[PDB]
Structures are given as structure tokens and as C-alpha cells.
Amino acid sequence: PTLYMNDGMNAQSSQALHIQTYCNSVRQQIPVDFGRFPNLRESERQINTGLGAARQHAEHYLKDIQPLIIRNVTNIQDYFETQNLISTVMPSGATKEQWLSALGMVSDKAKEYQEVSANTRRTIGSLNDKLIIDSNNYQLIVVNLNNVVNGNNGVLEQLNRDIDGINAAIDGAIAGIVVGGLLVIGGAIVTAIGAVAGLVTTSTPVVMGGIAMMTAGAGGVIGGAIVLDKSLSAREKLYRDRSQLNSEVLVASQIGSGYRGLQTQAQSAVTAATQMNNAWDSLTSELETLNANLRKGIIDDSFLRQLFLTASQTSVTKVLDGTKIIKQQMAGVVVREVPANQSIADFVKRLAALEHHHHHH
């Protein structure tokens, strides 16, 4: 259970930094301006209404959920510091009753923290559910606009699936970068937000879902930009290839892709939250089994003492080490401003060229 707890914590913490950055990109998205086309006023208002709801979903995550996930790390640290302390306090000839008191104190903490993880899982499950509905309904606003300007709905839908497909690649590259950097002592996570497509001027730039996450090592040395550059540039390319689509349909499409991308992050958060809740479940079960087996007299104090002792010398070390690195990295995220005349792909491409020069390669 100690390693299950470790893996749950690592997966939820890394994914939490990913959806956090995605939510920031949704919050920073500027309303769409189709002022130059009075006949698209209705579409402009439907798109800004859906965007407002997306910003509220993102805000809900940042303010109401992110802190519970960070609280979970702290709860893991307190749990294991407490289990460890039991090991150092219980003297030699401690009675069954004293051991039952001690087991009780750790089971109470574990159940308290299991319930916090469970409530976190429900809250993210609900947000994911709402995002599935809102992102699915948003697509009708885009088709409707495409119909108002007699665009080809086949070409639009193809672009939508192509962007979904490249977003899996971008997500997987960001996930691998963050997982790989989460447990580096002295390492930091670096994020940037920027337009998802190449810029062209009077169209509203879409930063929603335009994210980069990279690592920084000793001396602020960026890692991950070379890897990430490939999938970011590919998205920019896929948009470039549909410059025959109406400009406003393209913007509307970019928000839709950002709305679906947000729902994808929330599904990843559900999966991580489930894995963490299952880890707590197996921790409380183990304690309940030790509580019953000591009472049934199937085990004894001596076994329990050695069980907690070994744990404290072994897998608990890894968890406690992880809790400290994870809190530093989640608290030390470095936010890079992207200039208004650079896409997220442009920005990372420039960081990738700097990364090549630092590697002399």
C-alpha cells in the first residue's frame, strides 16, 4: 500500500500541474471579436457565452479543486510522519491495548484523508461531467456559424478530429515532461501560454489550450522544449492547412478545441483522483485488517512493531521524499510570459533552438 500511495500521489500531482496550466490558458482567453461582421453578432455572443462558461469551469478547478489535490500531498506526509512516529514511541513490551490505541490513531487519520480524497474525486467527476456536456453542446454553435457563412461542415469536422488527434500527442509529451521532472531535487516546472495557431494581421488569437510545460534544471536550464516543439508545430501546421475555412469559423473552432481539451484534462484528473482514492482505500483496509488480526490474535505486537519499522526504513522514505519534492515543485512553477506576436509553437521553437545550443547539439 505504501508504493500504491506513492504512485497515486505522483500521478495526481503531475497531472494536477497539467490541468492547472490548461485552466490558466482558458482564464486568459480574450472574448472573440467579430465586430467587423455585424451579420455574425449572434454567433459572437453564443461563442463568448460558451467561453464565459469555460472560464468558470477553469476557475472552479483552480480555486475549489487544485487546493484539495495539494492538500492530499500534505495529508500523505502527515499520515506517514504519524505512522513513522508510532514506530519510534511504542516501547518494547507495549500491550495489545496500547497497540490497538496506536492502530486506532493511524486508522482515524487514514480514514479522514481517504474521505478528503473521495470528496476530491466526486468534485472532479462532476466537473468532468459538466465539461462533457458543455464542450459537446458548444460544437453546435460552431456548426451554426459555419452554416451562416456556407463553410463545408465536412472540412470543419475533419479539422476538429485532426486537432483532437494532435492534442493527444501534445498532452502525452507534456505528461512525460512533467512526470520526468516532478521528482528532480533542484528542478522546476516552467509553463507558458500562447496562441494555438500562427498569427495573421485582425482575427482573435486563441490561447485557450495553447500551453507548454518544460523542466528547468540547475541555472534555469530549460528541458523538454525540443520534444514539445514537434507536437506544438504540428498543431500550428494542421490549422495552416485549413486557411480556406472562414477566419471566424477557425477562431470558433479553436475555442471548441480548447473546450474539448479542457474536458480531456478533467478526464485525466478523474483517472488520477480515482487512483489516489483507491490507494487510500487499500491503506485503510490494511489498517482495518491489522486491527482485526490483532484482535482475532492471528498476529501480535512484535509483528506490528516490525511491520511499521521496516515500512519506516523502506517505502515510507520514498513517499516522504516525494511529498517534499512535489510540494516544492507545485509551489515553484515558473510562468513565462509569451509576447503577443508569438504563438505558443513559435515560443517553444525559440526555446528549443536555445536548448540545442546549451547541449552543443
Numbering used by the authors: 4 to 204, 207 to 366
Sentences from the paper on this structure:
As expected, soluble SmhB folds into the family observed β-tongue structure, with a five-helix bundle tail (α1, α2, α3, α6, α7), and a head domain containing three α-helices (α4, α5, α8) alongside a four-strand β-sheet (β1, β2, β3, β4), which includes the β-tongue motif (β1 and β2). The head domain of SmhB is largely hydrophobic. This is particularly evident in the β-tongue and helices α4 and α5, which together constitute the predicted hydrophobic transmembrane region (G175—L233). The B and C components interact at a binding interface located around residues 95–123 of SmhB, this could break latches 1 and 2 on the B component, releasing the β-tongue, C-terminus, and N-terminus to initiate the transformation into the B component pore conformation. The release of the C-terminus from the β-tongue agrees with the observation that the start of the conformational transition in NheA occurs at the C-terminus. This is further evidenced in the structure of a second crystal form of SmhB, where comparison of the B-factors for the two chains in the asymmetric unit revealed high flexibility at residues 85–124 and residues 280–320, corresponding to the proposed binding sites to SmhC and SmhA, indicating that movement in these binding regions can occur to facilitate complex formation.
Tripartite α-PFTs are members of the ClyA α-PFT family. Proteins in this family undergo a large scale conformational change from a compact soluble structure, where the hydrophobic residues are hidden often within a β-tongue motif, to an extended pore structure with the hydrophobic residues exposed in two extended α-helices which insert into the cell membrane. Here we show that S. marcescens has a tripartite haemolytic α-PFT (SmhABC), and propose a mechanism of pore assembly. We present the structures of the soluble A component (SmhA), as well as the soluble and pore conformations of the B component (SmhB).
